């Protein structure tokens, strides 16, 4: 099937991933269907940026899962782009959803407790909440 | 294991490979698992081509190493259509990256450097920067 070369990663994963240009951002992993270009080359996968729903082809060697969180998370990235911001917004939020996390109630703001319950390693459920399905 | 007909080119080599209508074109061996489709016959392998990122059995007797560039990179084809152009790009820089070369940073743009270093035997790698791992 689509992406059946060996390499980690499937449809649905949330990653950071890596392009020239760029800090590591977060993405999810989504099938060559979903991008009205073409099928991904061998130990490639299409990615779909949060943030601003852009698809790039990368290498899985340039993907991490997104649950490691603090070994990517790039704070001066962070300090200096309001798009980085809304990126980890839109990301963390996904991943909230899919962990069956809750949070107690502006954008500074409402990110804050997702994003220290990201830096701090997704608990209750780890990394193991945020996967697909 | 697959591909073990004493014949040449194994998974991740970079080739050129000739269909009949078509130019020389860059491709990728793949394993027959990737493609969604059918077992290799004897002799033959599949490619994946750069720029439609589209699937080909192929005779391992219609391939030759990417590394021989510019005796099969056809200038008229390039200049002639768009989709040679993103087929040499993507191919190139699969070819940069398992290299480890870099390039200072548009399409013809980005390219020219690329092809130069290809027209000019991948330096200062050679050909031995084309293998894959
Ligand atoms: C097509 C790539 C757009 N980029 C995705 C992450 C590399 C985010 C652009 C916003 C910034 N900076
Ligand atoms: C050998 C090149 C074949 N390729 C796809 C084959 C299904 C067409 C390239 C697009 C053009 N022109």
């Known amino acids: 099937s689509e992406y ?7 449809i649905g994963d949330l990653v950071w ?5 760029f800090s590591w951002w977060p993405a999810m992993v989504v099938s060559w269907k979903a991008t009205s270009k073409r099928q991904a080359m061998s130990g490639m996968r ?10 790039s ?6 993907l991490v899962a997104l649950g490691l969180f603090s070994q990517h ?8 782009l309001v798009s980085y911001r809304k990126a980890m917004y839109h990301a963390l939020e996904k991943a909230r959803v899919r962990a ?3 949070f107690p109630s502006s954008l500074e703001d409402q990110l804050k407790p997702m994003l220290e319950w990201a830096h701090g390693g997704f608990k209750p459920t ?4 945020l996967k697909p399905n």
Chains 1, 2 share one sequence.
């Open 4 to 10: 059946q070369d060996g390499k980690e990663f499937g």
């Open 100 to 102: 069956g996390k809750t």
């Open 73 to 80: 998370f790039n704070l001066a990235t962070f300090n200096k």
């Open 126 to 129: 780890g990394i193991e909440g």
């Open 57 to 62: 082809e990368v290498s899985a060697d340039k």
């Open 17 to 21: 991933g890596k392009i020239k240009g």
């Open 46 to 55: 299409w990615v779909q940026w949060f943030g601003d729903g852009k698809f």
